[PDB]
Amino acid sequence: ATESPATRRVQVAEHPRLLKLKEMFNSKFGSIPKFYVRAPGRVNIIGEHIDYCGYSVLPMAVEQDVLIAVEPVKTYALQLANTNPLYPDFSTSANNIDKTKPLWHNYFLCGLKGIQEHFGLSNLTGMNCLVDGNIPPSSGLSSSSALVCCAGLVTLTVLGRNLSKVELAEICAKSERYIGTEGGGMDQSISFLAEEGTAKLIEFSPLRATDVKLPSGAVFVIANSCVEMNKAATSHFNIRVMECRLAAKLLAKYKSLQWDKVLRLEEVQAKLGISLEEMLLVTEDALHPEPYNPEEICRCLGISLEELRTQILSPNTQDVLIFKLYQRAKHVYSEAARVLQFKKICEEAPENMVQLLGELMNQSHMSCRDMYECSCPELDQLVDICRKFGAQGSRLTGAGWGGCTVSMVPADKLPSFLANVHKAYYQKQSLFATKPGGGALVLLEA
Ligand SMILES: Nc1ncnc2c1ncn2[C@@H]1O[C@H](COP(=O)(O)OP(=O)(O)O)[C@@H](O)[C@H]1O
Ligand SMILES: CC(=O)N[C@H]1[C@@H](OP(=O)(O)O)O[C@H](CO)[C@H](O)[C@@H]1O
Ligand SMILES: [Cl-]
Ligand SMILES: [Mg+2]
Ligand code: NA
């Protein structure tokens, strides 16, 4: 709708975290914070690597979040600090993102920048901020987005301007891209739009969030592989985006569309008016399974190597020489269908629901592992263990190449799953049960 992030009264005393934030802020800046902002991380139940392709996804917010204590100031200076020494203090007074190197404060700046630009503001929003995030970083739980989103909300609030949760999501999804990742809007959308007690089907263009009621007899558990993967510091992520972009263009061309304008896999389907099942057949016909090379792509599209490199590919991807068009498209179209089916099942709630939902997750994991090639040994091993121990469904979550897994565990298997999994892979940080949490909020002291 037009609804904005809520502002809630809390008793600092009851929240070890805010108390701590409060006290450290005062010691750090000499004054108590005027307000706080929280933006949660999230677990994607199913629908991996498709948001940027324009397809609907099914995440839910987790409890872990990024919490920021704030104090507006008159100077046009931004002073940032973190409760974790791993993240150095930083200050700026700049009127106008390096993306030469991913320093933590640049994620905060992406968020601030999106907001200031949205309002055509040139000057820096003056403030003192102390950051505390408890989402395991670079683990597929969107710690980067929680930070960007929290920073955007902070900025908005300091500016005293208004934005709906939807616009916040839209703006943050584009601003995070200044860090250099060419991802989608799932993470930012769920961070602002989540509601406690329900997952959301997040659809794009236009952005809409729809409640999805999860199975009553099973519990979702996150288990971190503990292999860290920093999306902004590596090229893996963007290569996949490009492969999809290129696949979309070739598909369009093969179907005689105006491919030059095409950027996403979903557009092709949309333009053709066919079903996802049908898009798989088109894919099968239009894209050869063996990889594509730059020169071949260039000949197919009727463009130049230079056009490709500078006009289509991203800087961090201009020297890619192997494009797995077929596999990426196949993963995408099949995965977008799985999300739709998962939602349908949750709504109809058949008897064998957990089982069916579980199968969809397992199918998702194998497509990610085999077709999108975004899993890793540790993830595969953990997923096996989860299943061994009771998970009806288990798969990697978030971008992959390390990070977390998400398992759907029957209630009765819960206690044993946890102990067994722990014992098996880890010999509440890396392994913990979760449930659908609420979205980003503004906090004022009770
Ligand atoms: N609590 C935190 N404090 C400061 N920066 C953080 C925090 N959590 C995440 N970040 C930033 O986000 C980066 C991780 O982003 P990313 O690789 O996209 O992981 P994720 O899968 O969690 O979104 C970190 O390297 C750090 O720069
Ligand atoms: C800000 C960003 O790019 N996040 C993207 C990234 O998630 P994570 O950084 O693992 O949370 O990968 C997932 C894979 O489904 C989506 O593509 C999403 O849009
Ligand atoms: Cl850093
Ligand atoms: Mg991220
Ligand atoms: Na749409």
Curated annotation (Swiss-Prot):
Catalytic activity field: N-acetyl-alpha-D-galactosamine + ATP = N-acetyl-alpha-D-galactosamine 1-phosphate + ADP + H(+)
EC number: 2.7.1.157
Active site annotation, chain numbering: D187 (proton acceptor)
Binding-site positions, alpha-D-galactose: R42, E48, H49, D51, D187
UniProt-listed SUPFAM superfamilies: GHMP Kinase, C-terminal domain, Ribosomal protein S5 domain 2-like
Coiled-coil features, chain-numbered ranges: none
Quaternary context: Monomer.
Membership in a protein family: Belongs to the GHMP kinase family. GalK subfamily.
Name recorded for this polypeptide: N-acetylgalactosamine kinase
